[PDB]
Design an enzyme around this catalytic site. Structure first.
Site, PDB file in Angstrom:
ATOM      1  N   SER A   5     -17.953 -51.674 -16.524  1.00  0.00           N
ATOM      2  CA  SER A   5     -17.458 -50.930 -17.830  1.00  0.00           C
ATOM      3  C   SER A   5     -17.144 -49.416 -17.611  1.00  0.00           C
ATOM      4  O   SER A   5     -17.787 -48.917 -16.738  1.00  0.00           O
ATOM      5  CB  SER A   5     -18.808 -51.260 -18.853  1.00  0.00           C
ATOM      6  OG  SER A   5     -19.934 -51.304 -17.386  1.00  0.00           O
ATOM      7  N   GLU A   7     -16.435 -46.410 -19.046  1.00  0.00           N
ATOM      8  CA  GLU A   7     -17.873 -45.139 -20.611  1.00  0.00           C
ATOM      9  C   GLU A   7     -16.727 -44.234 -20.802  1.00  0.00           C
ATOM     10  O   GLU A   7     -15.813 -43.062 -20.210  1.00  0.00           O
ATOM     11  CB  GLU A   7     -18.855 -44.078 -20.359  1.00  0.00           C
ATOM     12  CG  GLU A   7     -19.752 -43.733 -20.865  1.00  0.00           C
ATOM     13  CD  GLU A   7     -20.512 -43.220 -21.036  1.00  0.00           C
ATOM     14  OE1 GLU A   7     -21.534 -43.420 -20.523  1.00  0.00           O
ATOM     15  OE2 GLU A   7     -20.747 -41.630 -21.096  1.00  0.00           O
ATOM     16  N   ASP A  99     -29.954 -35.540 -26.575  1.00  0.00           N
ATOM     17  CA  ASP A  99     -29.861 -34.439 -26.141  1.00  0.00           C
ATOM     18  C   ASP A  99     -30.624 -33.645 -27.171  1.00  0.00           C
ATOM     19  O   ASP A  99     -29.922 -33.910 -28.891  1.00  0.00           O
ATOM     20  CB  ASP A  99     -28.265 -33.772 -25.471  1.00  0.00           C
ATOM     21  CG  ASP A  99     -27.775 -34.369 -24.462  1.00  0.00           C
ATOM     22  OD1 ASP A  99     -28.577 -34.366 -22.897  1.00  0.00           O
ATOM     23  OD2 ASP A  99     -27.260 -35.710 -24.872  1.00  0.00           O
ATOM     24  N   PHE A 195     -23.056 -30.344 -14.004  1.00  0.00           N
ATOM     25  CA  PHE A 195     -23.819 -31.695 -14.930  1.00  0.00           C
ATOM     26  C   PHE A 195     -25.479 -31.992 -14.180  1.00  0.00           C
ATOM     27  O   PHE A 195     -26.033 -31.936 -14.908  1.00  0.00           O
ATOM     28  CB  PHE A 195     -22.725 -33.044 -14.723  1.00  0.00           C
ATOM     29  CG  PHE A 195     -21.519 -32.890 -15.931  1.00  0.00           C
ATOM     30  CD1 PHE A 195     -21.830 -31.628 -16.737  1.00  0.00           C
ATOM     31  CD2 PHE A 195     -20.809 -33.557 -15.894  1.00  0.00           C
ATOM     32  CE1 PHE A 195     -20.846 -31.515 -17.664  1.00  0.00           C
ATOM     33  CE2 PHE A 195     -19.933 -33.571 -16.178  1.00  0.00           C
ATOM     34  CZ  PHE A 195     -19.274 -32.944 -17.658  1.00  0.00           C
ATOM     35  N   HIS A 245     -20.835 -48.768 -13.869  1.00  0.00           N
ATOM     36  CA  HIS A 245     -20.524 -48.438 -15.286  1.00  0.00           C
ATOM     37  C   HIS A 245     -20.175 -47.201 -14.631  1.00  0.00           C
ATOM     38  O   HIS A 245     -20.874 -46.349 -13.699  1.00  0.00           O
ATOM     39  CB  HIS A 245     -21.888 -47.927 -15.824  1.00  0.00           C
ATOM     40  CG  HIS A 245     -21.939 -47.654 -17.075  1.00  0.00           C
ATOM     41  ND1 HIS A 245     -20.955 -47.897 -18.512  1.00  0.00           N
ATOM     42  CD2 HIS A 245     -21.525 -46.382 -18.163  1.00  0.00           C
ATOM     43  CE1 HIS A 245     -20.941 -47.729 -19.336  1.00  0.00           C
ATOM     44  NE2 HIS A 245     -21.413 -46.907 -19.133  1.00  0.00           N
TER      45      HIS A 245
END
Ligand SMILES: Cc1cc2nc3c(=O)[nH]c(=O)nc-3n(C[C@H](O)[C@H](O)[C@H](O)COP(=O)(O)OP(=O)(O)OC[C@H]3O[C@@H](n4cnc5c(N)ncnc54)[C@H](O)[C@@H]3O)c2cc1C
Ligand SMILES: Cc1cc2nc3c(=O)[nH]c(=O)nc-3n(C[C@H](O)[C@H](O)[C@H](O)COP(=O)(O)OP(=O)(O)OC[C@H]3O[C@@H](n4cnc5c(N)ncnc54)[C@H](O)[C@@H]3O)c2cc1C
Ligand SMILES: Cc1cc2nc3c(=O)[nH]c(=O)nc-3n(C[C@H](O)[C@H](O)[C@H](O)COP(=O)(O)OP(=O)(O)OC[C@H]3O[C@@H](n4cnc5c(N)ncnc54)[C@H](O)[C@@H]3O)c2cc1C
Ligand SMILES: [Hg+2]
Ligand SMILES: [Hg+2]
Ligand SMILES: [Hg+2]
Lengths: 267, 274, 275
Positions: A5, A7, A99, A195, A245
């Site tokens: 998949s 994103e 978040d 990140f 993913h």
């Protein structure tokens, strides 16, 4: 077989818009099980998330799963969003808390009441930075599953052992759903480190070395990043993982290449 | 202490305009807790509602509550209207679904949705409609009762009932609201009947039952307006007396822009000027 | 006028019972009931009779006939076939019940809500389900049983019809608790006019329905007096129906036991007469 998949996130510029659609076209040929579009706490962007999912489902026919957060929205509103989605043929959604501005389990139940939705939730191999303990967060994941989550997509990771150990603890804790690993192909280390610091994700010493000195070398960075990513999925694949993913960040090339090494090719 | 409120409707003509203002002056002396103005489907009873509310407020300094309908309004238009009212001192709105025109029948937005929308704008005082004899379009009596609780849970401060001629209808309904957990004042709506032929038309379309004894009281008075006024006033005064004995401390009168009957009934209720 | 009535008949077991049934149907049809329903037994012969009586009613009277259907001794596929056939034959209202569990070897895994769901998958039927003001005997709690009703309504049930009762307070409190659970359908009271007390006691004993002491007193000594029993039982039924109407009830379902007089008379006092 291997299920993948991709994103994406809502583009904020004209350039980013075109880049996104090109990658969407390029990655559709790999026939992913589904593709997801991110959602951030911004009304206009919330509209953008909707439009993109629709455009996707309308030009590729692929299953498009929108992200939805429990944050900044009343239960009745969420329910109408759900009914609006289900009505537009969008029967798969990625349920998250969101978040926080300077819970997930409830949003799962909320959605199940509306319809028999296919829900995906977030898993944290290295513990969500807020949970008081590994166990607490682990039990929370279980709650989200018990509520109706079909799949669990993990936050990106660089330490394969952290993930393998976590996956084991999940089954040992009674979680009967697949812990789909989230893969982040790194081409910009500086950004990746940012990140990781935020998400509490640990970057192994060896990876820091691999990117040391490549600050101005964009090409070499992509080569090293792809190598690291391909090694990852190779190990994960041999270890039993058949679902991946990818966090594309609207860029096709690295994910396309990694998929090719997994046998995920156009036909 | 007994509290009262009066409901008016936007006048379509010059003569109707005058009657209304005369009634407003007469009824204002009773110092009602609030006064409200109808909001129809046509601009006559829509644009005017706003004007009359401003008028009432300026001329008397009484709390005026405009009625608001979601019928042919976009959520955007509704918020615009709500903000204007609030900013201009209007802190109470009567939120209704509105009489859908017999033609298009689309089960879209409902009153509870309007309530929610209004509460998003400001901490308004919202009054919603209650039906002791059930709303004619309801799935069932239980569903209608659940809808009232839904609107109370959405933010409604009080419920004003449709008019009724059978006092027991009100009394049973109030008991059901309490058993169901609806913790707001169930204000009975009173319709003083001066003209029976016109009252039958209203009740007929509202699913409000007219007792046989009441139809008997107005029998033969078709051309005797004076006797109809006396009889009708008697009926209203007795109903109101019973209700008070039963604990009702708030009444809402459907004046139809006429002051005489409502004024007289209020007087016997003990609510008189200073 | 604004009051709706429905009558329940069961498949006759003898030639005598059959003549009685059709007579009652003719007599009761003049009251223009909202609908009539026919009971569903467990043995194959009965189940077939249900179908034929429903057909007989539909043809002979042109009234809306609603058959009962249970889960007992049937596979989901037999049930769907039966439902599809019913729909194609014009009968579009079914009273869905789990069914009386026989004292044999078969644990219940399928419940009424499952039947409602299955029936809804076949077609947009008007579905009626059972309600219990005094709690179903097998329910582990009053809360469970009430939540079960909500479950059946959520599955697609248009209305509830309660088990008979002799204490009106039981119906009234239950009607209230239904609202507190969020059930939005009208709960139609099931009225059982009693002429034979010993038989009524039997039915009650096995249904967890309580017969008030004063009621037992009313029938004491009338065992060999059918006439008095009928007058006493009618008076009781009429009073109960009177109280219910004053309390807002505008819908009634009569367990006629295939007899017309008592239900007819009670109906007459409600104002539901031939026109
Ligand atoms: C695949 C993926 C996609 C994402 N997509 C988005 C996106 O589109 N938009 C966005 O804003 N964010 C997104 N995020 C980030 C995410 O929303 C944040 O990490 C957020 O802080 C947590 O969301 P959650 O659903 O994991 O929250 P939760 O599962 O609710 O858990 C969050 C925290 O709450 C704790 N917890 C849960 N229940 C309780 C409780 N009852 N009491 C105490 N502690 C409790 C957990 O232990 C943890 O610390 C995504 C994450 C992943 C892995
Ligand atoms: C005090 C009072 C003042 C009024 N003033 C006016 C006025 O100024 N202007 C005007 O146009 N009309 C006015 N009306 C009349 C009113 O608008 C009509 O009766 C209208 O038909 C219903 O309005 P409501 O606010 O009761 O709607 P609602 O409370 O929404 O109910 C309408 C119907 O829909 C049902 N319902 C609710 N939710 C649902 C759902 N989710 N699904 C299915 N059915 C549902 C209810 O059971 C009921 O049958 C007033 C009525 C009262 C009693
Ligand atoms: C109007 C009416 C008509 C009837 N007609 C007939 C007829 O034609 N034929 C016939 O055979 N019987 C008939 N009966 C009797 C009925 O079938 C019995 O009372 C039966 O025992 C239950 O049927 P039900 O539909 O209420 O079952 P359900 O609603 O499924 O409930 C039965 C019991 O199971 C419980 N329950 C429900 N769901 C669950 C669950 N998931 N887990 C555990 N417990 C659960 C309930 O609380 C209750 O105790 C009728 C009853 C009524 C009131
Ligand atoms: Hg949230
Ligand atoms: Hg509306
Ligand atoms: Hg069954």
């Amino acid at each position: 077989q291997i299920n993948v998949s991709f994103e994406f996130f809502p583009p904020r510029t004209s350039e980013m818009e075109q880049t996104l659609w090109n990658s969407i076209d390029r990655l559709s040929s790999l026939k992913p099980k589904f593709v997801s579009v991110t959602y951030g706490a911004n009304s206009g962007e919330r509209d953008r998330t909707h439009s993109i999912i629709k455009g996707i489902k309308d030009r590729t026919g692929l299953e498009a799963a929108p992200h939805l957060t429990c944050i900044d929205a009343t239960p009745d509103e969420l329910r109408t969003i759900a009914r609006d989605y289900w009505n537009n043929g969008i029967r798969h959604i990625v349920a998250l808390r969101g978040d926080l501005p300077p819970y997930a389990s409830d949003l799962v139940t909320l959605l199940k009441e509306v319809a028999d939705f296919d829900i995906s939730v977030a898993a944290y191999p290295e513990v969500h930075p807020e949970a008081k303990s590994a166990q607490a967060d682990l039990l929370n994941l279980k709650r989200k599953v018990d509520a109706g989550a079909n799949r669990a997509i993990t936050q990106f990771f660089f330490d394969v052992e952290s993930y393998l150990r976590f996956r084991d603890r999940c089954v040992s804790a009674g979680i009967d759903v697949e812990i789909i690993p989230g893969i982040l192909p790194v081409s910009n280390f500086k950004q990746a480190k940012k990140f990781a610091d935020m998400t509490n994700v640990r970057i192994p010493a060896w990876m820091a070395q691999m990117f040391d000195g490549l600050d101005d070398d964009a090409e070499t960075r992509k080569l090293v990043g792809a190598n690291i990513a391909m090694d990852m999925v190779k190990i994960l694949s041999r270890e039993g993982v058949k679902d991946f993913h990818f966090y594309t960040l609207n860029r096709a090339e690295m994910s396309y290449a990694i998929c090719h090494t997994l046998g995920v090719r156009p036909a």
